[PDB]
Amino acid sequence: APSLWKGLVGIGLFALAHAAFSAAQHRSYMRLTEKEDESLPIDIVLQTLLAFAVTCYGIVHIAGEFKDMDATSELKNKTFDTLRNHPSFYVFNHRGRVLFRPS
């Protein structure tokens, strides 16, 4: 699912860049002709807005973490058996060591 969102964001960005290039070409043409104070075509403007709205949808989905506020829920599954052992104090005196010693 994240890969699809990333690809969609990339495609939208590419479409936005293409719309920018089209608008640049339109203004370059406009500078050629005297007067003619007209606006850019509405179709490419709508394409620009479509590319802007699509890229803002995946930009929120890509980073969604929203962790739980309460601090009791993560330790709701953890068992006291694992907590009983600690990594500081480890005594290396067990029957498994002499049982696994030959093999």
Next chain:
Amino acid sequence: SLAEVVCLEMVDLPLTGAQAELEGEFGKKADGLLGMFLKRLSSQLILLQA
């Protein structure tokens, strides 16, 4: 005969081939959204070929 000059004026040049081509390609009288999109695609293809 270029010594005594009475009146003088300066005029510009007609146009450039690529510039004229772009100006003609932009020229639209009455078209739908599909038409403008097709024209833009054709212009993009021409630019890619160039």
